[PDB]
Tab-separated table of N, CA and C in Angstrom:
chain	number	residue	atom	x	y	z
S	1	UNK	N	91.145	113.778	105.369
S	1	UNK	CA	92.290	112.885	105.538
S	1	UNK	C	93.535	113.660	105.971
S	2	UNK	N	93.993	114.933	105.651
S	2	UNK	CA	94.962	115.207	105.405
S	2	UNK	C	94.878	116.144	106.593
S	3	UNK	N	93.832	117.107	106.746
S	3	UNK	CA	93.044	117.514	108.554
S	3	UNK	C	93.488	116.557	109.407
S	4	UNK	N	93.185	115.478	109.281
S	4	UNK	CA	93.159	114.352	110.450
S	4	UNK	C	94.724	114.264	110.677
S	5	UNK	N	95.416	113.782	109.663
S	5	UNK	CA	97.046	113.597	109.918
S	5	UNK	C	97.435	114.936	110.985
S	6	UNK	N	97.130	116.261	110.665
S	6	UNK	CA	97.499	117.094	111.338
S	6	UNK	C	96.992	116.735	112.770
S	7	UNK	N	96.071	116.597	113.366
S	7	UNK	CA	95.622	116.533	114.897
S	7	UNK	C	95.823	114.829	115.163
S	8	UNK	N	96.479	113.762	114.159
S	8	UNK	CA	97.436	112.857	114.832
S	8	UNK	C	98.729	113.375	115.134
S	9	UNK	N	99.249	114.513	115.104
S	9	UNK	CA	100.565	115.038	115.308
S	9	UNK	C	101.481	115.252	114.051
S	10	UNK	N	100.913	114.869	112.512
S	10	UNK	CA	101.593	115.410	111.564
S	10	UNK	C	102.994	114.530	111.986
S	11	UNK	N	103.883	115.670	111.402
S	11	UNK	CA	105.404	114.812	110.928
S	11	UNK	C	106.060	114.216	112.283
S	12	UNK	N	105.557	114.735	113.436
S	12	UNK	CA	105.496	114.420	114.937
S	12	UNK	C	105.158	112.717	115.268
S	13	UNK	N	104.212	112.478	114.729
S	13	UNK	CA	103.692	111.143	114.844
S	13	UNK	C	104.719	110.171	114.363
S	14	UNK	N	104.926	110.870	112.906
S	14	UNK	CA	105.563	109.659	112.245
S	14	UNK	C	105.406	109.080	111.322
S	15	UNK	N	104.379	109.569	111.020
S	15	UNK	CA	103.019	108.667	109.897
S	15	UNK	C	103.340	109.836	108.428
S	16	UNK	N	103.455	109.362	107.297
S	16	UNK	CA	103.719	110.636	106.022
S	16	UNK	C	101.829	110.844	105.737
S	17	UNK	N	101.957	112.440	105.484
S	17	UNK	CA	100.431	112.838	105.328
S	17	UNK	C	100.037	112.158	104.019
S	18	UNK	N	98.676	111.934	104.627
S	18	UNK	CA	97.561	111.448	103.173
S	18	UNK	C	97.546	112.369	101.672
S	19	UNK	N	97.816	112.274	100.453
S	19	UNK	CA	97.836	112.770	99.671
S	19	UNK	C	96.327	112.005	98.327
């Protein structure tokens, strides 16, 4: 989950990472 946020672009995207 938290892999994946990174290669959607992380804090870039927009989206807060999966915890």
């Amino acid at each position: 989950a938290y892999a994946q946020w990174l290669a959607d672009x992380g804090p870039a995207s927009x989206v807060p990472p999966p915890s």
